[PDB]
Structure formats: structure tokens, C-alpha cells
Amino acid sequence: NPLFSPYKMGKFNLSHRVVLAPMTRCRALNNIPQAALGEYYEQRATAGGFLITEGTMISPTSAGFPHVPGIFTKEQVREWKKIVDVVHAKGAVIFCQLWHVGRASHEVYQPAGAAPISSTEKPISNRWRILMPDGTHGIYPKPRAIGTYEISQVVEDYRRSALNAIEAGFDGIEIHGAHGYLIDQFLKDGINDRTDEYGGSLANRCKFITQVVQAVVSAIGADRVGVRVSPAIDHLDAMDSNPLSLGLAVVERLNKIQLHSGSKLAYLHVTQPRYVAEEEEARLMRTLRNAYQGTFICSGGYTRELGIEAVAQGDADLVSYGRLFISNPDLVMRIKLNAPLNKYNRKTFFTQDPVVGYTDYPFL
Ligand SMILES: Cc1cc2nc3c(=O)[nH]c(=O)nc-3n(C[C@H](O)[C@H](O)[C@H](O)COP(=O)(O)O)c2cc1C
Ligand SMILES: CCOC(=O)/C(=N\O)C(=O)CC
């Protein structure tokens, strides 16, 4: 089974290639990591296995879901440290995903009820609705388009959050540059209508992600930084006229950052365009993998068979699993044994209970 051959992800010696994909679960009450998160990640940790956390706030304006953790305060750092310690005791490697939602937010999630921030004034359309803290669904508002001073402040928020992640004991961080969130709102020409140095051309649209990645690489080292993108995705009105060219432009910049830094990033993590909340889709994935000088993690709709094939055929080095990892704490072992998998319950993906639908899915 190729999923159980070891893999050197830079300095990290992994014993298998099954990765816990980053998943927002909304148990981090008041944006503080809770003991429940420790039990959840401990359940899923394996010796030499790689885990990526739920998206984690970099600042008070970065959230668009209820009860998602932050890593911008010392209180949050202190509580993450307990979670990281229990995962490390199982021998796992764990990265914290740094997440800013940009315009995918609501007044209820913003300090003082202010407008969310974005590259543009364009709102997500009413085809999409935002989950509210009471379980109803609301309307995405018009965001505020930020200037270059505020852009530099957001870059600094990523940099400080990366340092805070290292202080908490994380092995590294992942930049959430995917899925129509803040970074993708700069990348995608269906969103970014700017006329300054951050829009107007593909090169300008890539400026923001480039600066974010350079800042975190400078702070913690390239080998502790992963980057997630999704150039082709049906999520929150985040479309590009040329997804493959957009992806390749991002890859070129990551390759150049590595050459400048003298070290490779931890990895590039790419969402299969099939995933929502063909050979054109497989065309895109393999084209980006072949273009990138480093470790490639694929995600989105993978199964045991599809993950085996991806690694066997050279399409990916690591395979991240989301939904099946929700309901199978021992997913790694089940994949190794080809054991039957448990169903997952969408109704408890984003509820707040520390146990129900979170840590009470059974082991084999
Ligand atoms: C409930 C849920 C929460 C998710 N949260 C995040 C997130 O916070 N950050 C992110 O990059 N992807 C997130 N994803 C996407 C997953 O990381 C992953 O790519 C996807 O679940 C893989 O497809 P699969 O569920 O078929 O394995 C989430 C997915 C689900 C189902
Ligand atoms: C569909 C692609 O977008 C995602 O997977 C995602 N976050 O990145 C969420 O669903 C947040 C809960």
C-alpha cells in the first residue's frame, strides 16, 4: 500500500501519507481553543502522521464562522500549547492553518459590527448564505476595499500569527489561500477589480499571496510553511477566467520564493475542483503538481482507492482527507486494514457540543 510508505516532508519524517485535512468545526468557544479540540486531534493523531488544524484566526476581523479558534492572543497561544502537547505525545506532526475569510463574513462576526474587509467592494451574491451563530443563515454584506497600508497590516497579522504558532509548539503553519477567502479574493479575476498594484494583471493579483508567503517564510522558515490554493473552485463566487494560468502563476512565485530563501516550503496543498461545500480536473491537478518544485498534497473527494492511485501514479505525495476523518478517528488504521468506514453526520459539522458529533464517533 503506497499510502504507507514513509515520506520526508522536509525535516519531518512521516510514516504514512494520510493527512488530516483542515476542517472548521466551531468547538473553539469564544475563539479560544478548548479541551475538546485536544481530545479530537488526539483521537486522530498517529505516530508519524501529519495533521492540519481547522482554519485559525489571524486577527479580530478574520472570522466568518462562530467559535473558530484564533492564534493572535497570548490566551489562545496558551490553550493551543496544551493541544499541541497531546498531539506530539502521540508522535504526530501538526501544522496550524492561518485563515482570514475576507468578505465571507457578516456584521455579527466583526468587531463593532463593522463591514468585513476585501480586495473589492463586491459582495458575495445571494446565491450563497452565511451560517449565523444561532444556526440560521444570513446575507453576506458589501465588504470594505482595503488600501495598501491596511494590506501591509494584514500581512503583519499573518507574520505574527505564524510566530505565535511556533510559540505554541506547532511544527509549522499552512496559509489558507483557497476557497474564496481573503487571499483568493485578491487572486481571482472574478473578484479583484482593483486598479492599483494589487490588481489589473495576473502578476498584480498574485502580489498579496506572494507577500503573505514571504512574510511567514522570513519569520519561521520555509520548511515550516505550507500553502493551500484552489484555482478552480465553486465556492462563494470566486471564479477565474483562466484557472490553470492562475495556478501556474502562483506556483512560479512559490518556486521563486524557495530559490530566494534557499529552502523548500513544507508543501503545496491543492483542492480538487470537484470538491464543494473529469479529465479537465485531473489535467489541472497534475499540471500544478508537475510545475511545483516540492511536496504536493491533494485534497477533495478522495477515497482509499483514489488516494492509493494518486500516490502510486505520482500525482501526489500526500493525500488529505476531510469528511471521512470527521467520522473515523482511526481513519489511518482503517485505510491500512481496508476496514469499513463510519458515516458522517453533516448536521453536527458546525455545532458547538464538545462531544456530540465531534469526539463520539467510534473507533474500530
Ligand atoms: C466541515 C468541513 C470544514 C472544513 N474546513 C476547512 C477549513 O477550515 N480550511 C480549509 O482549507 N478547508 C476546509 N475544509 C475542506 C477540507 O480541508 C478538505 O479539503 C475536504 O473536506 C476534502 O474533501 P473530503 O471531505 O471528500 O475528504 C472543510 C471541509 C469540511 C467538510
Ligand atoms: C468548499 C471549499 O471551502 C471549504 O472547504 C471551507 N473552508 O476552506 C469551508 O467549508 C469552511 C467551513
* Ligand found nearest the CA of 272: 1
Cα–Cα distance, 192 to 203 (Å, whole number): 12
For 195-200, which contacts have Cβ atoms below 8 Å and span 24 or more sequence positions?
196/148, 197/148, 198/119, 198/148, 198/151, 199/119
Q: Is 252 buried (19+), middle (13-18) or exposed (0-12) by CB count in 10 A?
A: middle
Cα–Cα distance, 123 to 139 (Å, whole number): 10
Cα–Cα distance, 81 to 275 (Å, whole number): 32
Beta-strand pair 137-138/130-131: antiparallel
Task: Please indicate the experimental technique that yielded this structure.
Answer: X-ray
Cα–Cα distance, 169 to 332 (Å, whole number): 24
Candidate of 24, 98, 352 to mutate for ligand 1, largest count of ligand atoms within 8 Å of Cβ: 24
CA-closest candidate to residue 94, choices 215, 221, 224, 217: 224
Is the CB of 358 inside a 6 Å radius of any atom of ligand 1? no
Cα–Cα distance, 288 to 304 (Å, whole number): 22
Given phi > 0 = left and psi -120 to 50 = alpha, else beta, which region is 147?
beta
CA-closest candidate to residue 49, choices 91, 89, 110: 91
Index of the ligand 2 atom closest to the CA of residue 230:
2
Q: Which three cell numbers stand for residue 232?
A: 478552480
| The total number of structural domains that make up the chain | 1
* Ligand found nearest the CA of 276: 2
Q: Which three cell numbers stand for residue 319?
A: 493525500
- List, in order, residues 6 or more apart from 325 with CB less than 8 Å away: 20, 21, 23, 44, 331
Q: Which residue has the cell 475569510?
A: 101
Find the 320 Cα to ligand 1 centroid distance in Å: 9
71 close to 80: Cβ distance less than 8 angstroms: yes
Q: Which three cell numbers stand for residue 279?
A: 479529465
Pocket of ligand 2 (CB under 6 A): 24, 178-179, 235, 275-277
Is the CB of 19 inside a 6 Å radius of any atom of ligand 1? no
Cα–Cα distance, 42 to 23 (Å, whole number): 15
Q: Which three cell numbers stand for residue 348?
A: 453536527
102 close to 182: Cβ distance less than 8 angstroms: yes
Q: Beta partners for 145?
A: 118
Beta-strand pair 144-145/117-118: parallel
Index of the ligand 1 atom closest to the CA of residue 325:
27
CA-closest candidate to residue 224, choices 10, 65, 38: 10
Of 109, 181, 198, 358, the active-site residue reads: 181
Find the 295 Cα to ligand 1 centroid distance in Å: 20
Find the 259 Cα to ligand 1 centroid distance in Å: 30
Is the CB of 23 inside a 6 Å radius of any atom of ligand 1? yes
Q: Which three cell numbers stand for residue 320?
A: 488529505
Find the 49 Cα to ligand 1 centroid distance in Å: 18
Rg (CA), the chain: 19
Cα–Cα distance, 132 to 105 (Å, whole number): 10
What is the 3-state secondary structure of the chain? CHHHCCEEECCEEECCCEEECCCCCCCCHHHCCCHHHHHHHHHHCCCCCEEEEEEEECCCCCCCCCCCCECCCHHHHHHHHHHHHHHHHCCCEEEEEEECCCCCCCHHHCHHHCCCEECCCCCCCCCCCEECCCCCEECCCCCEECCHHHHHHHHHHHHHHHHHHHHCCCCEEEEECCCCCHHHHHHCCCCCCCCCCCCCCHHHHCHHHHHHHHHHHHHHCHHHEEEEECCCCCCCCCCCCCHHHHHHHHHHHHHHHHHHHCCCCCEEEEECCCCCCCHHHHHHHHHHHHHCCCCEEEECCCCHHHHHHHHHCCCCCEEEECHHHHHCCCHHHHHHHCCCCCCCCHHHCCCCCCCCCCCCCCCC
Is the CB of 24 inside a 6 Å radius of any atom of ligand 1? yes
Q: List the domain range (segments joined by +) for residue 251.
A: 1-364
Q: Which three cell numbers stand for residue 201?
A: 494583471
Cα–Cα distance, 209 to 187 (Å, whole number): 8
Is the CB of 180 inside a 6 Å radius of any atom of ligand 1? no
Cα–Cα distance, 144 to 120 (Å, whole number): 7
Resolution in A: 1.4
Whether residue 292 lies in the annotated active site: no
Candidate of 235, 271, 320, 323 to mutate for ligand 2, largest count of ligand atoms within 8 Å of Cβ: 235
Find the 283 Cα to ligand 1 centroid distance in Å: 22
CA-closest candidate to residue 328, choices 359, 351, 297: 359
Neighbours of 309 (CB within 10 A): 15
238 close to 274: Cβ distance less than 8 angstroms: no
